[PDB]
mmCIF file with all atom_site columns, C-alpha atoms in Angstrom:
data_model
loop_
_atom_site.group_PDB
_atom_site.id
_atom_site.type_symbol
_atom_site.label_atom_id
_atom_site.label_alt_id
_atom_site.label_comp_id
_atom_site.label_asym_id
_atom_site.label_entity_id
_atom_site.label_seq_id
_atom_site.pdbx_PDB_ins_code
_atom_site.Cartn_x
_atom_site.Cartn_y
_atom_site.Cartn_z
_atom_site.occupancy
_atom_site.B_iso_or_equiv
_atom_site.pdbx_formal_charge
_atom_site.auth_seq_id
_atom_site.auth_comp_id
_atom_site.auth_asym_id
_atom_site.auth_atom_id
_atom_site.pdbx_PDB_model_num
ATOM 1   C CA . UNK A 1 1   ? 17.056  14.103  27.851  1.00 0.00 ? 1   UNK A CA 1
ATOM 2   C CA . UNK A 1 2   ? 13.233  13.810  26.582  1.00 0.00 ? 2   UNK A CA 1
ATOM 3   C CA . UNK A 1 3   ? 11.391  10.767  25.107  1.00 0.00 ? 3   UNK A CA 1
ATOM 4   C CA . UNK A 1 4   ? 10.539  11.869  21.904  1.00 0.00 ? 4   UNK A CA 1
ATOM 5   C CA . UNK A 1 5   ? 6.428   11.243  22.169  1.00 0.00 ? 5   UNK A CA 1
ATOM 6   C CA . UNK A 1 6   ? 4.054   12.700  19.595  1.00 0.00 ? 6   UNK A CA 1
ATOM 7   C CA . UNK A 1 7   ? 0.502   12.012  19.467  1.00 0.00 ? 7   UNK A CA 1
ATOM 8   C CA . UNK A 1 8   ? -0.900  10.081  16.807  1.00 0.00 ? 8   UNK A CA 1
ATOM 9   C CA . UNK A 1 9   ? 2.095   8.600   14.625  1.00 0.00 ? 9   UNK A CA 1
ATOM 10  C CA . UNK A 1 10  ? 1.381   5.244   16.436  1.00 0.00 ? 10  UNK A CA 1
ATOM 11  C CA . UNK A 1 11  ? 2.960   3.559   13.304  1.00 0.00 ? 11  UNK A CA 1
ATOM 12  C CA . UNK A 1 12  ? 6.366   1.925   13.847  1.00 0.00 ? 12  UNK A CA 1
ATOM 13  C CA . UNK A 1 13  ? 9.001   0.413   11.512  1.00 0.00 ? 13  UNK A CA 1
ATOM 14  C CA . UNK A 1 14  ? 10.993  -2.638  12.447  1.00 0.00 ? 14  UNK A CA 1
ATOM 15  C CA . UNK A 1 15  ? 13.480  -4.179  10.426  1.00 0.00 ? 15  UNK A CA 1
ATOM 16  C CA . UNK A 1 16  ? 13.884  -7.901  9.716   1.00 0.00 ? 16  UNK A CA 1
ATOM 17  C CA . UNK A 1 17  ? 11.236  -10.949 8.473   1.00 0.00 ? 17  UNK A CA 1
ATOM 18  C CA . UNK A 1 18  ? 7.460   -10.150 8.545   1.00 0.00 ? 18  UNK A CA 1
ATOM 19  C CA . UNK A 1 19  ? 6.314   -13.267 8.405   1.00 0.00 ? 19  UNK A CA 1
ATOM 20  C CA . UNK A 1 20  ? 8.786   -15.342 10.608  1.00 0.00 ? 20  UNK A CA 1
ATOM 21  C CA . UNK A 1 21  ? 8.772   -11.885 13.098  1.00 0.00 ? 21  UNK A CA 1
ATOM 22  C CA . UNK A 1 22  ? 5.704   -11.678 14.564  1.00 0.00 ? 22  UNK A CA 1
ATOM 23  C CA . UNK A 1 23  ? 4.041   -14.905 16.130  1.00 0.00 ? 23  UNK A CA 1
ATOM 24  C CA . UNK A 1 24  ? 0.272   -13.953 16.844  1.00 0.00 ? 24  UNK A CA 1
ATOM 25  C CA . UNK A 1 25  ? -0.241  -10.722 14.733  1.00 0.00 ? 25  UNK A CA 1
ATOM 26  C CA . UNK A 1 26  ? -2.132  -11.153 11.374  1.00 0.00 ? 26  UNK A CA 1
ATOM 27  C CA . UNK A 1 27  ? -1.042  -9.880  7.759   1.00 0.00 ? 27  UNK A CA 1
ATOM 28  C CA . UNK A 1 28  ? -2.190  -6.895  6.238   1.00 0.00 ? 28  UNK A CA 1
ATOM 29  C CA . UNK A 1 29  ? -1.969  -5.720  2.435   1.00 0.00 ? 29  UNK A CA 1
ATOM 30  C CA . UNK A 1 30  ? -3.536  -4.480  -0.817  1.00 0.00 ? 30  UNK A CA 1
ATOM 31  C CA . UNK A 1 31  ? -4.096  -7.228  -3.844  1.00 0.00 ? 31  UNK A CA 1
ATOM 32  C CA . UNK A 1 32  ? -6.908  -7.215  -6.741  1.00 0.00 ? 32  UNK A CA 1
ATOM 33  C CA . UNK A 1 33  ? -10.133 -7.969  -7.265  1.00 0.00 ? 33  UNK A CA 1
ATOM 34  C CA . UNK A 1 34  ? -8.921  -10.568 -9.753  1.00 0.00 ? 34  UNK A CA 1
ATOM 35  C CA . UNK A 1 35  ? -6.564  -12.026 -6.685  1.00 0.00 ? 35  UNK A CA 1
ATOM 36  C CA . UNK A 1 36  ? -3.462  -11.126 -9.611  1.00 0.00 ? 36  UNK A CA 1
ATOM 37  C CA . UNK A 1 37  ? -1.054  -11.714 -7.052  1.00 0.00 ? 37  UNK A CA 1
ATOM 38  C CA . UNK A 1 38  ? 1.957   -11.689 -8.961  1.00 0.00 ? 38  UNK A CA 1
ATOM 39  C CA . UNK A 1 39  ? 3.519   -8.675  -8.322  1.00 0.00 ? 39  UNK A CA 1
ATOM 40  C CA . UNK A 1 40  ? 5.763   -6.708  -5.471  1.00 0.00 ? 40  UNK A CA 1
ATOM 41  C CA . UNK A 1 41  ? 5.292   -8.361  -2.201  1.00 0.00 ? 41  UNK A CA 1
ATOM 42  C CA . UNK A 1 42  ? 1.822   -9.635  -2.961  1.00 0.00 ? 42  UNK A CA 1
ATOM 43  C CA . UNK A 1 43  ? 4.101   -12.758 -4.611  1.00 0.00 ? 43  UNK A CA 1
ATOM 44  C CA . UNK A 1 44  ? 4.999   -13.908 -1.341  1.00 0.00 ? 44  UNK A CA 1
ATOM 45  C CA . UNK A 1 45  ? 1.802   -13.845 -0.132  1.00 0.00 ? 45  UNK A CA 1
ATOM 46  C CA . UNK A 1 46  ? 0.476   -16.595 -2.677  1.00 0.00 ? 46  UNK A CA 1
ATOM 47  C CA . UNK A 1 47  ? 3.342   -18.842 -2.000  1.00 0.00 ? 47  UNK A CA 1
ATOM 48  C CA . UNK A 1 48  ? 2.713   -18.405 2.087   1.00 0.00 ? 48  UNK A CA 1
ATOM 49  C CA . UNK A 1 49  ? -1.282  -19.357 2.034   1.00 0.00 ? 49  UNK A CA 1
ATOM 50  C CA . UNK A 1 50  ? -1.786  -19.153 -1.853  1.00 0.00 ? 50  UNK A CA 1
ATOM 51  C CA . UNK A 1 51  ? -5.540  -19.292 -1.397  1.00 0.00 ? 51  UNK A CA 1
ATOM 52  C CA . UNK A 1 52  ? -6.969  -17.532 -4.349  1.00 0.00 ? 52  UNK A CA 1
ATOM 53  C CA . UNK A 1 53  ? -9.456  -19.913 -4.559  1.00 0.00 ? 53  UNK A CA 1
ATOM 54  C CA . UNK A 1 54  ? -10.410 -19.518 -1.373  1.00 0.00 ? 54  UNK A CA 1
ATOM 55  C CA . UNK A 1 55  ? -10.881 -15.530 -1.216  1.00 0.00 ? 55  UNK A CA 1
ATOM 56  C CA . UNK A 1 56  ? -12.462 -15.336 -4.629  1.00 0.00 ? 56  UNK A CA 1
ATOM 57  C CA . UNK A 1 57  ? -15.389 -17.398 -2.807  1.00 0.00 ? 57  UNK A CA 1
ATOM 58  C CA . UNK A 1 58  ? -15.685 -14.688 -0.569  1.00 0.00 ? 58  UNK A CA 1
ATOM 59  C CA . UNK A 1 59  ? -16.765 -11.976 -4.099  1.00 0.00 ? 59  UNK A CA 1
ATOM 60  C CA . UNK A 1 60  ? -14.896 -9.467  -2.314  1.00 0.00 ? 60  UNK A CA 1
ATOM 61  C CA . UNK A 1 61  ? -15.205 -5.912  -4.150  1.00 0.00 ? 61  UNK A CA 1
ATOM 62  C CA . UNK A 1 62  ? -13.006 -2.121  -3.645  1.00 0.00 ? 62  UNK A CA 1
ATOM 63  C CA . UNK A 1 63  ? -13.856 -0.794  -0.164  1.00 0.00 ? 63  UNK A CA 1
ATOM 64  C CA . UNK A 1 64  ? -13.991 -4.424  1.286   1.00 0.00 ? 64  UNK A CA 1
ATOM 65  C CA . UNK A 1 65  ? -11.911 -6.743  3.506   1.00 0.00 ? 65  UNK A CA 1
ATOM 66  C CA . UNK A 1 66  ? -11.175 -10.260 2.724   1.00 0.00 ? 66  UNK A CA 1
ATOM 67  C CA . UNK A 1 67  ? -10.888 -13.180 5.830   1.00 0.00 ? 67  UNK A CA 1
ATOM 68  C CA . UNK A 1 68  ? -8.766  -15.436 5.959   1.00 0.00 ? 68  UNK A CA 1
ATOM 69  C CA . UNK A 1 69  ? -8.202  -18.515 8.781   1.00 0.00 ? 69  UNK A CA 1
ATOM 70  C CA . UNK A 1 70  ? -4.968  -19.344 8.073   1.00 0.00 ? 70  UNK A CA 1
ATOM 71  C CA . UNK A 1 71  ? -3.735  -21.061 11.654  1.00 0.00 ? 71  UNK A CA 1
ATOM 72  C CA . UNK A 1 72  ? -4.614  -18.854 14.535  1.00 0.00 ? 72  UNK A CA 1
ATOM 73  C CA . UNK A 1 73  ? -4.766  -15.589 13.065  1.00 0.00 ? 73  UNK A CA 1
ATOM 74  C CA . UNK A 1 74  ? -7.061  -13.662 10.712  1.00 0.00 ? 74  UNK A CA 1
ATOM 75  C CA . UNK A 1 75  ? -5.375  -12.534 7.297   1.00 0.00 ? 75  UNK A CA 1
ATOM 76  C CA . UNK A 1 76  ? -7.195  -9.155  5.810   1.00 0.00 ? 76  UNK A CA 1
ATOM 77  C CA . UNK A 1 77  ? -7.189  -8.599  2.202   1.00 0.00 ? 77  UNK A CA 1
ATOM 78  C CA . UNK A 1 78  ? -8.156  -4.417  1.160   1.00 0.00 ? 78  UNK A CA 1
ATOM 79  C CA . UNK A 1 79  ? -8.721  -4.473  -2.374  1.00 0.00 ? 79  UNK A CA 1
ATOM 80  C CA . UNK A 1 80  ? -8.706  -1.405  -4.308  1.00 0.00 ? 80  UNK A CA 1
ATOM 81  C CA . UNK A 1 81  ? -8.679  -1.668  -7.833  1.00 0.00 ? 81  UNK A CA 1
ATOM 82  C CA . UNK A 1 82  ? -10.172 -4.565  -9.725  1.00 0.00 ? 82  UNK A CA 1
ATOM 83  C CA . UNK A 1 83  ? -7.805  -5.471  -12.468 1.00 0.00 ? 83  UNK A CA 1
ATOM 84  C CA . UNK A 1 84  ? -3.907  -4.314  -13.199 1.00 0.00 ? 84  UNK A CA 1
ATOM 85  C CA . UNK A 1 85  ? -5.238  -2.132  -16.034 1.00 0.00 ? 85  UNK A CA 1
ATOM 86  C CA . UNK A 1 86  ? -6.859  -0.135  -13.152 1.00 0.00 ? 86  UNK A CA 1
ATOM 87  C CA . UNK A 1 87  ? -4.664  2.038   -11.077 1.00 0.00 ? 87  UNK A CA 1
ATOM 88  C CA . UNK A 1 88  ? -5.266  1.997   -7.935  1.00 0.00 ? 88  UNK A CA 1
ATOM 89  C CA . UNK A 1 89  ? -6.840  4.711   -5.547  1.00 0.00 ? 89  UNK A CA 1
ATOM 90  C CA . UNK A 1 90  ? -6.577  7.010   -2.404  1.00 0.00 ? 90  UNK A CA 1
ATOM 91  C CA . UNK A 1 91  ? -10.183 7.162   -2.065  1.00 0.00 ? 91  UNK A CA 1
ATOM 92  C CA . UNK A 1 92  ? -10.899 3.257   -1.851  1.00 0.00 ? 92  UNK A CA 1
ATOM 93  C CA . UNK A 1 93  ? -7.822  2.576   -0.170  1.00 0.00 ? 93  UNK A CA 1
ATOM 94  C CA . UNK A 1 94  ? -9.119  4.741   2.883   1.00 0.00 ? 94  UNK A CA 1
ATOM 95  C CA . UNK A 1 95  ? -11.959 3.081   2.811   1.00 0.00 ? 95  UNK A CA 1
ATOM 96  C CA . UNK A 1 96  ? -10.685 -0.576  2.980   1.00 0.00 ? 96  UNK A CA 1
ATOM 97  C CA . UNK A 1 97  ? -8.714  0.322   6.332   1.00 0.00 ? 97  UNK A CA 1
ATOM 98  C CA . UNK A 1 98  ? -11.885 1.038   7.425   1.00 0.00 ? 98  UNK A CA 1
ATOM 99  C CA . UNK A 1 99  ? -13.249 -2.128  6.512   1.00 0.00 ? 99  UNK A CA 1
ATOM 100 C CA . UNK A 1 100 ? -10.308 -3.873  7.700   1.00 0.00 ? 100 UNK A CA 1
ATOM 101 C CA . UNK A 1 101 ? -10.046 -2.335  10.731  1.00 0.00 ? 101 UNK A CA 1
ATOM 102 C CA . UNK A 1 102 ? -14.077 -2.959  11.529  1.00 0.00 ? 102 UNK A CA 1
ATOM 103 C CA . UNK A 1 103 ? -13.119 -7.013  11.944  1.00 0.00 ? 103 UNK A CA 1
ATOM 104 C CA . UNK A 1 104 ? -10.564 -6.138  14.320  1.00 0.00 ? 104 UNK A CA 1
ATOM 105 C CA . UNK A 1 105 ? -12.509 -4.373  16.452  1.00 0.00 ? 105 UNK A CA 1
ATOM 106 C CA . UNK A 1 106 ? -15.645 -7.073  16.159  1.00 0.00 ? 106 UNK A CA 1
ATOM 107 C CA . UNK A 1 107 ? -13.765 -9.943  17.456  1.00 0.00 ? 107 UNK A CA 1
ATOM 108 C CA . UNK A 1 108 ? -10.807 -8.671  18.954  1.00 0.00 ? 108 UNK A CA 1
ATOM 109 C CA . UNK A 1 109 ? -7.110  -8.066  17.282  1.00 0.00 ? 109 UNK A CA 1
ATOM 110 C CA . UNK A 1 110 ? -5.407  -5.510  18.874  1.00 0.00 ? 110 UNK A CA 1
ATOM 111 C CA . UNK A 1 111 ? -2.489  -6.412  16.903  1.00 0.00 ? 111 UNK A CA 1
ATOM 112 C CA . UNK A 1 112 ? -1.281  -6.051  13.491  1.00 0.00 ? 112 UNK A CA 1
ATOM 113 C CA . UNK A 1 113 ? 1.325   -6.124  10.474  1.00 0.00 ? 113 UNK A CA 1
ATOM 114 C CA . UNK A 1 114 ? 1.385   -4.886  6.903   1.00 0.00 ? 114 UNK A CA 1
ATOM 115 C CA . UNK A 1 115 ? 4.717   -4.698  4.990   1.00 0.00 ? 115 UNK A CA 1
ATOM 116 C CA . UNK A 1 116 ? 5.325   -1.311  2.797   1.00 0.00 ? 116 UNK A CA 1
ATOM 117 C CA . UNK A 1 117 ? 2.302   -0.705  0.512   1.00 0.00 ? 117 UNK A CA 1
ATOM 118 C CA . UNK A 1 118 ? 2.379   1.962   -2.602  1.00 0.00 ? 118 UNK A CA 1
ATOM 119 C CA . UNK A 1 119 ? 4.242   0.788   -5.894  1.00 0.00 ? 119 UNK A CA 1
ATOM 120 C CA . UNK A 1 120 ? 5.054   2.908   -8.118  1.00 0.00 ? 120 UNK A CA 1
ATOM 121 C CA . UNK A 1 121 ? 6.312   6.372   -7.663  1.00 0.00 ? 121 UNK A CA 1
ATOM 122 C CA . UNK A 1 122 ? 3.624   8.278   -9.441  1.00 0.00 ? 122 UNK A CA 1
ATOM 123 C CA . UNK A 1 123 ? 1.049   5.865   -8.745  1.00 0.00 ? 123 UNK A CA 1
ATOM 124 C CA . UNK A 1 124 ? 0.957   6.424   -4.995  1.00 0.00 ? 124 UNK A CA 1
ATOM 125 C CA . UNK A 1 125 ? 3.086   7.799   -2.494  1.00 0.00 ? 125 UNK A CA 1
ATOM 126 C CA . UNK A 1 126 ? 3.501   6.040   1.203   1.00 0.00 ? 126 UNK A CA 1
ATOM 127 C CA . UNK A 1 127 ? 3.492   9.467   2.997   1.00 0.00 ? 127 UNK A CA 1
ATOM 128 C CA . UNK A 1 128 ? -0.056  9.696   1.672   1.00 0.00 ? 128 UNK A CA 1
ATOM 129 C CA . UNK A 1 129 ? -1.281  5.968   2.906   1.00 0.00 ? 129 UNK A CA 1
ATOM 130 C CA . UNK A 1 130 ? 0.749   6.065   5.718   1.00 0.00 ? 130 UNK A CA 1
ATOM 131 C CA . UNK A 1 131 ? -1.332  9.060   6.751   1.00 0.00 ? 131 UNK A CA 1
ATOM 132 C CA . UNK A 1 132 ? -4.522  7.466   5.840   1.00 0.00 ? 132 UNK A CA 1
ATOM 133 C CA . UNK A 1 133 ? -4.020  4.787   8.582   1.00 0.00 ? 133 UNK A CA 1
ATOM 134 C CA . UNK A 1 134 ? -3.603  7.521   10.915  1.00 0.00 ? 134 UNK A CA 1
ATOM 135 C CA . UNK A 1 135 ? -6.968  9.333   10.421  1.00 0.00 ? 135 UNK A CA 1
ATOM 136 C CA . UNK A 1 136 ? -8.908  5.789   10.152  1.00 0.00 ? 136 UNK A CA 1
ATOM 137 C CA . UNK A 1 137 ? -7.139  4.662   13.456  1.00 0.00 ? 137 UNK A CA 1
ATOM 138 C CA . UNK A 1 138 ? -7.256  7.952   14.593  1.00 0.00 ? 138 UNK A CA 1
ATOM 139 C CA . UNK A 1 139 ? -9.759  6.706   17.167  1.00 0.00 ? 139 UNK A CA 1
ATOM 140 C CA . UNK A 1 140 ? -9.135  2.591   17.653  1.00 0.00 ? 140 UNK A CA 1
ATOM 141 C CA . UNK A 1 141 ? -7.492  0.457   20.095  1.00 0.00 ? 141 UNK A CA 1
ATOM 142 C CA . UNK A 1 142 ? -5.160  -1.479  17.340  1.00 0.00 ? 142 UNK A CA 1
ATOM 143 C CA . UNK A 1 143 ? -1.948  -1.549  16.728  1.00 0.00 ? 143 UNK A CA 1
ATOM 144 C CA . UNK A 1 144 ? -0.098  -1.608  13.755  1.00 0.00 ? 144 UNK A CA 1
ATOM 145 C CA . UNK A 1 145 ? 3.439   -2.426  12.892  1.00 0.00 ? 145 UNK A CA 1
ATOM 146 C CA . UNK A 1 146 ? 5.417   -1.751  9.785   1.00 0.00 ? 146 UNK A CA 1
ATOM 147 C CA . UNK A 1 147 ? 8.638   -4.289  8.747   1.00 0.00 ? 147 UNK A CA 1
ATOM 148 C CA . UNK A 1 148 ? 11.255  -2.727  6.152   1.00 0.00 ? 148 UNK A CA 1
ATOM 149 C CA . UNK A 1 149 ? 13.031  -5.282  5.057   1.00 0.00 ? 149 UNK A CA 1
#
């Protein structure tokens, strides 16, 4: 008869659509410098807003945050690795949250979703990112959502 309530942990999984689900909360995710998106769920992306064009203007680099005025919301880009042939990183992933996070903060989006983000199963490993978020949010007012679907 207790509410199971941990600190921290603030990350929650919902399952259904991540696009059609929530109606105000921005995307979230990990692409290339080279805007290669043309693999995992990155595909969608491209077919939802598609704007390569329109991010490589912005000469995003690893450890920075792409914008992106979609509608009414703000769509963040974290870029770790430049090309394919380049694995991507714990280190610079870390650090993109934190320059993802930094826009939310500076306008004002206390709300946000990212789908599941860590291909391959020596590459990376979710418990690891999923933990990253934790320690970069650690101290923020934003909150995150993750759809399974």
């Amino acid at each position: 008869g207790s509410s199971g309530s941990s600190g921290g942990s603030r990350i929650t999984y919902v399952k259904g659509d991540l696009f059609a689900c929530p109606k105000t909360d921005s995307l979230a995710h990990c692409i290339s410098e080279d805007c290669r998106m043309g693999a995992g769920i990155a595909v969608l992306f491209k077919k939802k807003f598609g704007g390569v064009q329109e991010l490589l203007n912005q000469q995003k680099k690893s450890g920075e945050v792409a914008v992106l005025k979609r509608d009414g919301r703000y769509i963040y880009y974290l870029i770790t690795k430049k090309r394919a042939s380049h694995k991507p990183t714990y280190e610079n992933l870390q650090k993109s949250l934190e320059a993802m996070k930094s826009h939310c903060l500076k306008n004002g989006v206390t709300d946000l979703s990212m789908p599941r983000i860590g291909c391959g199963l020596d590459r990376l490993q979710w418990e690891n990112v999923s933990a990253m978020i934790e320690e970069v949010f650690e101290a923020t007012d934003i909150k995150i959502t993750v759809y399974t679907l």
